[PDB]
Amino acid sequence: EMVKTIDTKTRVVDVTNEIAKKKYQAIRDFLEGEEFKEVVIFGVYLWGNYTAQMLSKYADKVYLVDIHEFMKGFVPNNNSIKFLNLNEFKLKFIRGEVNPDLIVDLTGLGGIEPEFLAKFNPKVFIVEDPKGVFDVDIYEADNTYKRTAPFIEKAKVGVLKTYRKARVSKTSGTMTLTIDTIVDASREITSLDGVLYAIPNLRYYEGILFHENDIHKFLSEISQPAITISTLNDVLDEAEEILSNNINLIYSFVEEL
Amino acid sequence: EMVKTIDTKTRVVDVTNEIAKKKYQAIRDFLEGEEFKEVVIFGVYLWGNYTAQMLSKYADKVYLVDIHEFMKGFVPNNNSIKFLNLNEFKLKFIRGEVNPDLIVDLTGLGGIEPEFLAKFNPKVFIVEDPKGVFDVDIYEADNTYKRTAPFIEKAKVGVLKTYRKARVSKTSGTMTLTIDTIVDASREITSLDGVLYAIPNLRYYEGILFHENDIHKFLSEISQPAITISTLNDVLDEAEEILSNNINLIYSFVEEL
Numbered sequence: 001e002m003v004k005t006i007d008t009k010t011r012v013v014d015v016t017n018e019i020a021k022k023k024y025q026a027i028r029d030f031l032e033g034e035e036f037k038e039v040v041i042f043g044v045y046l047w048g049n050y051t052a053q054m055l056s057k058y059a060d061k062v063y064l065v066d067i068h069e070f071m072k073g074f075v076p077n078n079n080s081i082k083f084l085n086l087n088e089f090k091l092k093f094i095r096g097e098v099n100p101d102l103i104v105d106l107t108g109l110g111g112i113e114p115e116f117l118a119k120f121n122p123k124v125f126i127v128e129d130p131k132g133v134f135d136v137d138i139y140e141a142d143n144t145y146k147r148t149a150p151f152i153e154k155a156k157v158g159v160l161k162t163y164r165k166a167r168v169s170k171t172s173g174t175m176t177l178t179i180d181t182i183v184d185a186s187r188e189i190t191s192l193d194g195v196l197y198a199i200p201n202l203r204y205y206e207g208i209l210f211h212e213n214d215i216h217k218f219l220s221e222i223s224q225p226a227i228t229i230s231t232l233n234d235v236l237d238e239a240e241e242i243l244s245n246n247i248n249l250i251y252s253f254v255e256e257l
Numbered sequence: 258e259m260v261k262t263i264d265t266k267t268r269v270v271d272v273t274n275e276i277a278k279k280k281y282q283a284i285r286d287f288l289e290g291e292e293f294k295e296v297v298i299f300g301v302y303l304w305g306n307y308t309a310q311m312l313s314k315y316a317d318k319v320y321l322v323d324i325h326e327f328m329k330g331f332v333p334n335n336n337s338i339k340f341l342n343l344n345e346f347k348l349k350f351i352r353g354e355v356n357p358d359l360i361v362d363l364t365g366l367g368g369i370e371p372e373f374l375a376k377f378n379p380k381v382f383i384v385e386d387p388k389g390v391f392d393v394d395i396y397e398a399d400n401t402y403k404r405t406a407p408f409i410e411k412a413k414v415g416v417l418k419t420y421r422k423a424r425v426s427k428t429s430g431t432m433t434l435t436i437d438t439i440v441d442a443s444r445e446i447t448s449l450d451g452v453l454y455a456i457p458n459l460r461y462y463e464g465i466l467f468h469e470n471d472i473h474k475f476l477s478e479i480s481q482p483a484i485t486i487s488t489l490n491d492v493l494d495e496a497e498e499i500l501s502n503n504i505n506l507i508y509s510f511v512e513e514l
């Protein structure tokens with residue numbers, strides 16, 4: 001065998017997990033261990049469940065809310081965490097059964113409405129900025145700072161921003177950042193001695209999830225090795241190093257307003 | 258909704274076809290319309306069949322030879338081309354039933370042996386140089402000019418070289434160039450206004466072929482749209498233009514020895 005085949009040990013989901021950890025780490029630095037009575041998180045995809053699981057140790061009650069009911073499949077069936085679809089959450093709110101002191105909005109572009117958010121009175125409000133590199137259309141579609149507006153000078157307000165250092169990503173979306181990370185890594189790996197080519201093992205996940213509601217297929221596909229390499233040399237370690245370096249190019253922080 | 262999903266009309270196979278056409282055009286310019294009694298082409302993947310069908314108009318007999326029998330699946334039922342595995346071809350040689358005046362070697366790295374080639378006496382010999390940008394391991398593994406050595410100054414000898422302008426590719430392989438073209442295109446498409454991300458729809462085709470022998474799955478996978486785009490705006494025309502521009506970076510020519 002002169003030509004070999006090497007799959008990275010790092011999977012697509014490992015990349016998404018690492019990015020999710022950086023994002024929550026930014027939140028943890030922002031909150032500084034403050035405890036809450038009731039947390040509401042909007043948006044399960046893609047790192048809403050992780051956020052809920054982590055904040056649950058600092059909160060008596062945690063609600064994870066999504067406009068799509070099928071997203072419940074991503075929420076395991078026991079913990080301080082309660083999943084609700086948006087309509088269920090609105091109903092309980094009207095009944096005065098929820099009154100969160102921490103609200104986290106992860107819905108991004110075309111997500112939750114400022115009008116709805118304005119009905120609440122949290123101690124702390126965090127919204128994830130979906131924007132990435134400068135882009136006229138994306139900037140126009142974004143209304144992040146209209147979501148923060150009702151809480152300014154009334155609550156502790158933070159805007160979560162995630163970017164790639166000296167690299168281009170169009171959004172701060174976990175999967176988008178994952179895609180760009182893996183694609184970039186495949187290009188750098190290609191340059192390694194003896195490598196013939198490197199394939200980024202990505203699929204169109206939002207068609208699978210939001211148009212077929214097939215979570216298990218989604219989970220199966222992201223469990224694939226991030227990159228498959230055709231090479232004359234064992235470059236596995238070097239490939240893992242490139243993936244790790246690209247992951248660490250990702251920088252997440254919370255801007256306080 | 259706000260976010261759209263757009264597939265390119267160009268499929269993966271369309272890219273490979275374009276590259277195959279550029280490669281053959283270089284061969285056709287080299288051959289200058291010379292006609293032959295018997296053509297032997299080594300290596301069907303990925304553009305051996307196309308070469309065979311085109312040369313069939315200029316030859317009384319065309320043999321397409323591969324070390325792998327399952328490669329026969331790439332040779333359609335509606336042509337004059339004759340497939341032989343290497344052992345069958347060798348057997349015909351021993352019986353004195355083959356004596357090609359044109360030999361085309363497309364096997365690339367670790368391919369056909371110079372010793373075996375030296376057994377023949379063609380009028381014209383063409384070898385595809387598998388190399389791309391300089392790579393110490395690939396350069397060492399290549400023995401293109403030891404394959405030409407027995408035919409120098411006795412026959413018309415050409416070395417087919419295929420490269421990417423202002424880009425790095427490690428080999429001249431049709432699929433390799435296809436992979437690099439589509440990945441590069443997806444990155445450039447990503448930069449367009451309103452585009453959120455772009456996925457290159459590539460698979461690990463050599464696992465499907467050499468280790469599942471599933472040509473139908475391969476053909477099915479390459480018939481997929483080259484790139485899937487998540488975007489706020491309809492950028493289909495611009496995406497096809499970018500894909501076309503990247504394809505046109507590929508340049509093929511035959512160096513006469």
Ligand SMILES: C[S@@+](CC[C@H](N)C(=O)[O-])C[C@H]1O[C@@H](n2cnc3c(N)ncnc32)[C@H](O)[C@@H]1O
Binds near residue numbers: 044046106112174
């Ligand atoms: C586009 S994803 C955002 C991804 C996330 N910001 C990240 O970086 O990984 C939006 C998620 O929030 C949910 N969502 C969208 N609109 C919502 C709304 N109005 N209220 C609650 N959830 C919503 C969607 O179902 C989807 O799961």
Ligand SMILES: C[S@@+](CC[C@H](N)C(=O)[O-])C[C@H]1O[C@@H](n2cnc3c(N)ncnc32)[C@H](O)[C@@H]1O
Binds near residue numbers: 300304323363365368
């Ligand atoms: C790596 S591919 C070459 C791809 C081609 N040069 C291109 O650019 O598309 C090699 C092909 O030649 C065949 N092959 C490899 N060794 C061979 C040999 N010794 N004799 C005949 N065919 C061979 C393989 O089955 C495979 O189909």
